[PDB]
Each structure stands twice: as C-alpha cells, then as structure tokens.
Amino acid sequence: PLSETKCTLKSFTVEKGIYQTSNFRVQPTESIVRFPNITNLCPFGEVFNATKFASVYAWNRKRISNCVADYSVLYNSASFSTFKCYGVSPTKLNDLCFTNVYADSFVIRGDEVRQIAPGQTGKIADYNYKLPDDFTGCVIAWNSNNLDSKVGGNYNYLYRLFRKSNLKPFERDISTEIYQAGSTPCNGVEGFNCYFPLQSYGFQPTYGVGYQPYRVVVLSFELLHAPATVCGPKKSTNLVKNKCVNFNFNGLTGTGVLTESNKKFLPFQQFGRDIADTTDAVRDPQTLEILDITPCSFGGVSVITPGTNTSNQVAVLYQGVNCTEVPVAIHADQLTPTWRVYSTGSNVFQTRAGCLIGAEHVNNSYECDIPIGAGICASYQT
Amino acid sequence: TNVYADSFVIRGDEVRQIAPGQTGKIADYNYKLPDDFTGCVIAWNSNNL
Amino acid sequence: GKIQDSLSSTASALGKLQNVVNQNAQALNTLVKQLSSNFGAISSVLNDILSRLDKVEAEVQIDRLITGRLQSLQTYVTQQLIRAAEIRASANLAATKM
Amino acid sequence: VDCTMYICGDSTECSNLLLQYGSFCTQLNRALTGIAVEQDKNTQEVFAQ
Amino acid sequence: ICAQKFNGLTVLPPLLTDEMIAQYTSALLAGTI
Amino acid sequence: QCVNFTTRTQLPPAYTNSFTRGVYYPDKVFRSSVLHSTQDLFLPFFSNVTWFHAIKRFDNPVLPFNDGVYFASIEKSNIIRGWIFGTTLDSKTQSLLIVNNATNVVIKVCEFQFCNDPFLGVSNHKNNKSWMESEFRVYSSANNCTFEYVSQPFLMDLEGKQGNFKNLREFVFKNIDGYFKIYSKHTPINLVRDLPQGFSALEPLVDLPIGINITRFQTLHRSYAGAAAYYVGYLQPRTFLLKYNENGTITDAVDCALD
C-alpha cells in the first residue's frame, strides 16, 4: 500500500495522512452461460440453397426461430460476393442470441446491390424494398447467373417501375393497377403514358458484371429485449449462485453475484432493468425461476500512513465494507490490488466507515491525529 | 525506425483480409495484422507471371 | 415552548435544510440517469456494445460513451464545487453566529 | 465517484480508451476528495469552538 | 441508494458522528448557561 | 356465398369519454417501484371514444386504421370474434383476416375479394346439444396468399362464467414498418352502460410480419336474445408517465399532454 500511494501521488515521500487509491473489486471466480437447450439446426439450407428465389417486388420472408444457428459456416464460405453486417459483428453472431430472425430472399442486379443498404435511393429502394434507417442485421449477396440466367431469356423476375408514393420500410406490394403517368386518368390493360406497374429484365449470361443476376438474403433480427429463441451452437454451463460470476444470459453478458429473487416476471418478461438501464433481475432460459443480480463486493480503499520519513508502516481502510469477506478475499481467485498479506488477521477493526486492517484498536482516546471517519481516527504512537 | 517488407501471393477476393483487424481463412490462420498497424499495403494481379 | 408548537406542527420551517439534501440526491440521481442515455451510441449498456461489435468497430461507439459520461461527470463535479462553495459560505456564517 | 468505475464499469476495454483522456479522472477524484475534506473542516469550524 | 452505490457512487460518513456533534452542542449550551 | 342482407340499418355511432383506458406495457422488460415515461402510440385519457351497440338487425361498419387502433368490447357470450384489415378489400391490394371460428384462430393475408356484407352464422342445439358455426360468408377469392397462421381458438373466458359480470376484451393493434403488434387483456366489470372507470394495463400478445398497407378495418357477427357493445379509439404518438408499483404492474398513469 505504501508503494501504491507513492505511485498514485507521483512522489517518493508521502506526507502523514490518509490517501485514497485505486479501489478493490472481487474478480469473478468462473463464468456462467445459460441458453435454452434447443438442438435442432435452423433450416438455412432452404433459404440459401432454395430452388428459385422470389422476385424483388415479392421478396420472400422466412421466420426462422426455435432452432440453433451457426453463422460461422455461413461466413467462411467465399461463394458470397458481398457479406456485410450493420449493428453487429459477423464473428459475434455465434456468441449472441436472437429474439426473432427474418430472412428476406430476392434476386437483383450487381449495380443495384448498393440499393439494398438502408437509407439508399434507387428503383428497388424507392418502390419495392426499403430498409429502415436504423436497420440492424446482415446482408449477403452472390451472383447466380450459372443457375438463374438462361441463354433464351429469363423473364420470371419483375419489379415495380412506378408508385404513387415511396413505400414504407419492409413493405411488400402486389397490386397490378396501371400507373397514371399521364395527367388524364385511364383504364383498360394499357394506355398512352399509362405504364404497367411491373417491368422485367432479360436475364442472359452474356451480360457483364453489374447486370448479372444476384441472389440476396437479408437477416433483419432484433436483439436483447425479448424472449430470445435463436441462439448460437455453443453449449451452456451449469448454474451457480451466491458467487461473483461472469454470467451470460441469451447474449446479455455481465459480472455479478446471483441470488434467488422474488420478482414476478410476466411470461413475456425475461429481464428486469434498474434506474441506470442495467440488468437487475433475470429469468433463466432453462429453469423458469427468477434471479436477482448484484455487482459483487467492491468499494474504495484508503491508506493511512504517517510521514514516510518517520516510518514505512501503513494501515488500509476498505470503505463501506463489512469486511468479514476479506477472509473470503483470499488470493485463490484474483483481486485488483495484488497485495493481500494484510488480511493476515488479528488486527482487523470494524467501523461504520468500513474496516481498517493493519492498526490496533484501543480504548483510551486521543485527539484526531489522522481522520478515518465515523468518529474513528488513526495515529502512530508507541 | 526500421522497415519490414512482407511478400506473399493470395487469391484476389481475400485481399480485403490483408487489411488490419480483418478476419477470414487468411487472417485467422496464416497472416494477422495487429489492430494498431501503421504502414502501407500494396497488391497487384500477377496471373500473367 | 412555543418553539415546540412551531416546529412540530409545520414542516416547511426546516426547508432550508431539506433543500440541501434533496438537491444532492437529485444531483446524484440525474448522474445515475445519465448512464441510460445512448449519447449517439447504438446501445446504452457497454456490455451490449462489447458483445455485438468487434474490437475495431466497437471503439467508435465506446468513445462516444466515454465522451458523454465524462462530460456528465464534469458537469456534476462543477455543480458540486459550486454547491460546496455555497455551503462553505453558509457554514462560515453559522460559525460567525456561533 | 470512481471515474473508472462510473464510465467503464468492470470493463478493461473501456479503461484502455479512458486512459487516453489523460488526468480527467484524477482531477474529478481530487475535486471530490477536496469537497469531502471541506465538509469536515466546515463541521469542525462550526461546532468545535 | 443501492442503485447509486452499484455504479461507484459512494457516500462517505462524516468524521463527526451525530453523538459527537450532540456532545459539542451540550458543552456549548452548558457553558452558555 | 354471400347475400346482401339489407342496408346499413340506420346510424348507430355514439360517443363516450374513455376515462382511463389504452394503457399497455411499452416494452417487454420488468420494472418496479419507479415512475417511467414513454413515447409511443397510445389512447388519450378522457378521449372521445366511438361506441357501437348491437341492439332488430344491424351491420358493423368499416373504420379507418391510421396509427393503430385501440379496441374494446363490453360483451357477454363472446359475440365479437374477428377483424378485417386492408385498404380496398376487393382483391386489388393485399388484405388481412383474423377470425376465431370456434375451432381455432386463423390469421391470413391474401388478395381477398371480400363480400360487401361478410358474416358468420351458427346453428343452435342441432341434435348434438352443441352449437356449431355453419356459415362463413366472409370472402370469395384468395388468389395469392403469403402468410397463414393457425395456433388455437382464443375464446378465453375468465372466472365467474355465464356472463354474470360483463366481460371487457380490450386490445391494441399497431402496424409499424411491417411489424403488426397485438396487445390484449380481459377483465370482468359490473357496470351496465358506460365505459368502466378504472385503471388497467395491456400485455403484449402477438407480433407478425404482415407487411401490408392498412388504411381501414372492420370487425366481426355470431347471429343465432343478446346484445353487446364495442368501442373504438384512435391511438396517437404521445408521451405518458406510468407508475410501476412493487410488483411491476402499471398502477396509475398520467397523460403528459392532457392538461
């Protein structure tokens, strides 16, 4: 502690008094991973390896849930020309659970791939596929001219050419009403300046890069405020209580001590949040009990020391701690302050300010030489 | 201070993995840059060679 | 004895002390509430930022978080210093009256 | 108020970025300890005559 | 107060307890009277 | 089949002051013993709710759906069971149908060509002592369908039974960027005419990726001796302050833009 104070004050000589230093905190002993124990693999093949993809004006949405996903086998495949995620890291998709997953599949051209990203402007963006500006998820795109482009001309993919107004995000429109591009209204199958809303392209392999067909899939999952039912392939671990642990519930990580709580979470309620928007109660995904989480014991540490030119002996005050946990604060697990020999005992004195170790409590009273607090003061005397 | 030049040949589509902090079969297994890389990266096609 | 009637019946008499306490509590409570704001980052909880984002892209949101929270503590410390100066003035007046 | 614990609670990746901001945390801690000592000085001045 | 304490916001106790302040008050009042 | 069963049958609509209704949990997260403020779609307090009462013969009109709708049902025997959402409902644009037709609840989006007077019909005590819904005269053409969902029937009655205390079925429907959110609650009351004066909170029930333009909607009846009432209110984007008690149940609310 004297060396730590010398390091904090940036001086070799320390004047008599009390000095706060970097506080102690109990490093968690082990880690907890609690996931729902579903085992069935998600039907990713039916999405990525489907026979025919839906048209862009009728993009196909699949609700993927109640299954185990492994995004590593998806990422490591180089067949995908474009693979970018917004709001999440592809390497971290494995380690975090998903509330609900929507996979959108369609076919576009290379030059319009940029239109897939949220907030962009283009025919696809303006008329048949608009992403919200706050999109989170991933997008994957890869050319399919070897599977979807025909020499005789493929006309089975269409898009909406004009609209009365730009579509809302994630809106799908199927109406085939004629667009009245001219001022005069019209009816019938066709009319002058009366464009048919759907327009197709001639898929043919001779087209260069930028006009080749591209199969595109978008994952638009939302995270961490709902009963997540999609998780990575990593196995869970056993549950322990009354110890500071690195817990991880459904991708929500944290460090703290767990206890059997009594807060009635409704069936749609999985997490409870405090005033600081931090988690305080959690529902286990395997057992339906409710547990309170508390940040394990930490508090400020002060060093009481007379003048270094008088002595090198110090005492340390752990503030705000009924420190019968100091015997539990053994260096089998780790603590932020390395030194622990002062925990030897038989010189521990408990005060309303915490506990002071390294000083002997006496009955006879003297003037407050060095203030400790709560009426207790320290001094250096024979 | 000192200059160290690393030379190799890879497939073109994985050239992005040469950038620092990236991941992939190249970055994760045979050539990883540090997060605080300072320097330059040069790449060119060599199928003709 | 009239003091006994004055203090026990009305409660606003000790208001000059109560506002000393409440403000501090409020000054603390707002400081806690500042941990709930995004400050431009995609998520308020730093654990969420660490979990969802890789060590390269996470840094830009995390830096926003430190910027906002450090500004919040700077404001709180400045307010505490001003309030402590006011309380020192009141305490010096009390010492003079004593 | 522990500056490190407040901004960067139980996270070392946050502390790595926080240490780039210099002695702001130390200044805040010093100011708060100064206020703490000032409180006892006020109490002793008022009552310990 | 627990939520405040959990993020590193500690309330330190006064050096002079309410009993010691009462003792100074009693001494001052006794001296005055 | 579908038959033009008479005209609109006069003008039913009345108006009522919804004292304290349209309260739901803004998010699926527990929170206790605090005062929490929220910015979202809600029902105004003391709002001018529209009241429809089924006193004979009658029709249920089509009403606009903009910005989500709060629905309430003062009812016995659970006559009201369905809803239609859309813009045109004549197969020109996509249209959605939710029906609890005895066996189960079906939620189905198709290019429905809805008939001008859709309804459901039942047969009472036909040699089985049971009541069977024979007629389903709601739509005529369903060319293309993108989403179909059947889970369970939702005739969720509560305690008391036999309709001794009138059942309030209170729901909130929203359609935000293709996510359709349905919040639901049921509660007994002992009041005869007006909307009961009291506080309650709505739990989130269903979220669907319907993704369809919806400008108007209609309700659905069970023609068999019985009357029922239903109320419609229009949600608005506003901020409200909620008092979460010790148990995390919304105990009281204040409208941040009422007075």
* Residue in chain A nearest D41 by alpha carbon: A371
Calpha distance A356→A347 (Å, rounded): 8
CB pairs under 8 A between C and D: 65
**DSSP classification of residue A41:** B
Does A275 contact F247 at a Cβ distance shorter than 8 Å?
no
C residues 65..84 contacting A (CB < 8 A): none
Give the chain B residue whose CA is nearest to the CA of A91: B23
Q: Do D33 and A300 touch (CB under 8 A)?
A: no
- Residue F236 contacts A where some CB pair is shorter than 8 Å: no
Residue C56 near chain E (CB below 8 Å): no
Touching B (3+ Cβ pairs <8 A), the chains are A, C
A175: nearest CB among F34, F92, F203: F92
The Cβ of residue A362 has, within 10 Å, a number of other Cβ atoms equal to 10
Count of Cβ atoms closer than 10 Å to residue A200 Cβ? 14
| Strand-by-strand arrangement of the A244-249 sheet | A30-34, A244-249, A252-260, A290-294, A279-283, A271-273
Resolution in A: 3.7
CB-nearest to D17 from C59, C74, C94 is: C59
For residue E19, the chain A residue with the least C-alpha distance is: A375
User: Per the CB < 8 Å rule, is F32 touching A263?
Assistant: yes
Identify the CA nearest to F18 among candidates F98, F77, F74, F67.
F74
Q: Which two tokens stand for residue F2?
A: 């579908």
CA distance D22 to D5: 16
CB contact under 8 A, F177 and A265: no
Q: Which residues pair with F166 in a beta bridge?
A: F189
Distance, in Å, from the CA atom of D5 to the CA atom of D2, rounded to the nearest integer, reads 5
- Kindly report the number of other CB atoms within 10 A of residue C63's CB atom: 18
Identify the closest residue of chain E to A255 by CA–CA distance. Answer: E6
Mutation pick from D6, D8, D40, D43 vs chain C, by most beta carbons of C within 10 Å, is D6
Report yes or no on chains C and B touching (3+ CB pairs under 8 A).
yes
H or E segment to which residue D34 belongs:
helix D24-47
Q: Between F30, F144, F179, which is nearest A263 by CB?
A: F30
Question: How distant is the Cα of A91 from the closest Cα of chain B, in angstroms?
Answer: 8
CA distance C84 to chain B (A): 44
CA distance F249 to A269: 12
Amino acid at A194: C
DSSP string, A240-287: --SSEEEEEETTEEEEEEEEE------TT--EEE-TTS-EEEEE-SSS
DSSP F228-258: -EEEEEE-EEEEEEEEE-TTS-EEEEEETT-
Chains E and B physically touch (3 or more Cβ atom pairs below 8 Å): no
Q: Reduced to 3 states, what is the DSSP secondary structure of residue F167?
A: strand
Measured in degrees and rounded to the nearest 5, phi and psi for residue A102 equal -115, 120
Whether chain C has a CB inside 8 Å of the CB on B6: the answer is no
| D10, D33, D40: residue with CB nearest A20 | D33
Is the separation of the CB atoms in F200 and F185 below 8 Å?
A: yes
Q: CA A281, CA E3: separation in Å to the nearest integer?
A: 13
How is residue A76 written in tokens? 């490591």
Q: Partners for C (CB, 8 Å, 3+ pairs)? A: A, B, D, E
Closest CA to A115 of A106, A102, A103, A125: A125
Q: How far apart are CA D3 and CA F245, in angstroms?
A: 33
Helix axis angle, D24-47 to E18-32, nearest 10°: 30
Q: How many residues does chain F have?
A: 259
Number of cross-chain residue pairs from D and E with Cβ atoms under 8 Å apart: 31
Experimental method: cryo-EM
Judging contact as 3 or more Cβ pairs under 8 Å, the answer for D and C is: yes
Contact A76 B25 (CB under 8 A): yes
Q: Parallel, antiparallel, or unpaired: how do β-strands A271-273 and A279-283 relate?
A: antiparallel
Residues β-bridged to residue F16: F49
Contact partners for chain E, using 3 or more CB pairs closer than 8 A, are: A, C, D
Partners of chain D (3+ Cβ pairs below 8 A): A, C, E
Question: Does C54 sit within 8 Å of A91, measured CB to CB?
Answer: yes
CA dihedral F238, F241, F246, F250 (to 10 degrees): -40
A176, F146, F217 from A160: Cα distances, Å? 9, 18, 26
In 3D space, the residue among A196, A106, A88, A102 whose CA is nearest the CA of residue A142 turns out to be A106
The answer for residues whose C-beta is within 8 angstroms of residue A236's C-beta and 6 or more apart is A33, A34, A35, A37, A286
Least Cα separation, residue F98 to chain A (angstroms):
19
- The alpha-carbon gap from E22 to the nearest alpha carbon of chain A, in Å, equals 13
The SS3 assignment for A139 reads strand
Q: Does any CB of chain A come closer than 8 Å to the CB of residue D44?
A: no
Contacts of C26 (CB under 8 A, 6+ apart): none
Is F82 in a helix, a strand, or coil? Answer: strand
> Chain E residue closest to C29 (CA)?
E4
| Token reading at F144 | 């293309």
Of F27, F111, F213, the CB nearest to A225: F27
Is residue F193 within 8 A of residue F224, CB to CB? The reply is: no
Q: How many CB atoms lie within 10 A of CB B7?
A: 5
A253 CA to chain C: closest CA distance, Å?
Answer: 6
- For residue A327, what are the β-bridge partners? none
Residue with tokens 């059942």: F167
d(CA A240, CA A258): 8
**E16-32 burial by CB neighbour count: b if 16+ within 10 A, else e?**
beeebeeebeeeeeeee
Q: Does C60 touch chain B (CB under 8 A)?
A: no
Cβ distance of C33 and A92 shorter than 8 Å: no
With breaks defined as C to next N over 2.5 Å, after which residues does chain B break? none
d(CA F103, CA A300): 65
Antiparallel, parallel or unpaired: β F250-255 and F236-244: antiparallel
